[PDB]
Design a protein around this ligand. Sequence first.
Ligand SMILES: CCCCC/C=C\C/C=C\CCCCCCCC(=O)O
Ligand SMILES: CCCCC/C=C\C/C=C\CCCCCCCC(=O)O
Lengths: 158, 158
Amino acid sequence: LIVTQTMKGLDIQKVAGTWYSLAMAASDISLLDAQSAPLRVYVEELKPTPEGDLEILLQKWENGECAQKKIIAEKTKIPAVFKIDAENKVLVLDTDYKKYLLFCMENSAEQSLACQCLVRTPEVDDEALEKFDKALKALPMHIRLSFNPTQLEEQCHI
Amino acid sequence: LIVTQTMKGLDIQKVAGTWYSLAMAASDISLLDAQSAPLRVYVEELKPTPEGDLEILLQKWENGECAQKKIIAEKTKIPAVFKIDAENKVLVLDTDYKKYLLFCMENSAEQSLACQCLVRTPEVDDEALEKFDKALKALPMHIRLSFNPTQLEEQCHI
Ligand SMILES: CCCCC/C=C\C/C=C\CCCCCCCC(=O)O
Ligand SMILES: CCCCC/C=C\C/C=C\CCCCCCCC(=O)O
């Protein structure tokens, strides 16, 4: 239960659409170190279901190539928290729907933790990056990556 | 000439001895991404020469093993700036000699840039890490790593 920042008033339907993983951080280096690392995933689109589950389109480098993944985060009794089917919960820390979204993924244990700053456009948002860094300043992150606009328009951010 | 933080009054003899690379950052992900990445070096000891050159003992992972390296930074007319023989200049941004040292290495071009927060002891110094983050906040860093006390007592921080 390491993360104690959640979005109050979250309307999950309003996060539907295109996002860019501007920045990522994790608790352990190995979670993001290699391009095939377990939590180095690049968000493409969020597709909230009518009953409040969250289908996720993303890219991940596997076996020497940029692969497409589709996964579903199921709703919980808490609007800002979803569970991935594999126990790994996803939490929405903050979002303004129109520009940025900060979320973390953590495992039930440790804990193991990865967070991203998502943005709507392939641009460096300094002010979403500051909110991201503010949110993680107490979290025990040991790796942090960010991407430039060119990489953001590339599959797997090459 | 991207870095415009240098230590005034630097006495290079007083940086001799044992250091730990508590944290590292770089301008491009690939400079630190892999464990065999070009700038993922782990400082061991600094050995200032009598005439002001700076011999450096460090570790770097090469060809599937933690290798020992010994390199020399030659003095320039500027006390806080040394050149490595290979044009890559090293700059000392700040140090209190007894606890922390911040430096950057950059190539003549880009520029390509790597900085570290060095510390005397295998401990997380939050206040040297804040000075490190403050010094890099305007620099265009896209990867950032930090190590825990256990890793700090391991060769190549395993
Ligand atoms: C509200 C926004 C939420 C966005 C959530 C984004 C990603 C979901 C979290 C983690 C996904 C785990 C890694 C990808 C799994 C694919 C299988 C694998 O290769 O291991
Ligand atoms: C005042 C403290 C200065 C400390 C300087 C530390 C390191 C020097 C900077 C860069 C070293 C380049 C990478 C190692 C070179 C070995 C050859 C290689 O494998 O490419």
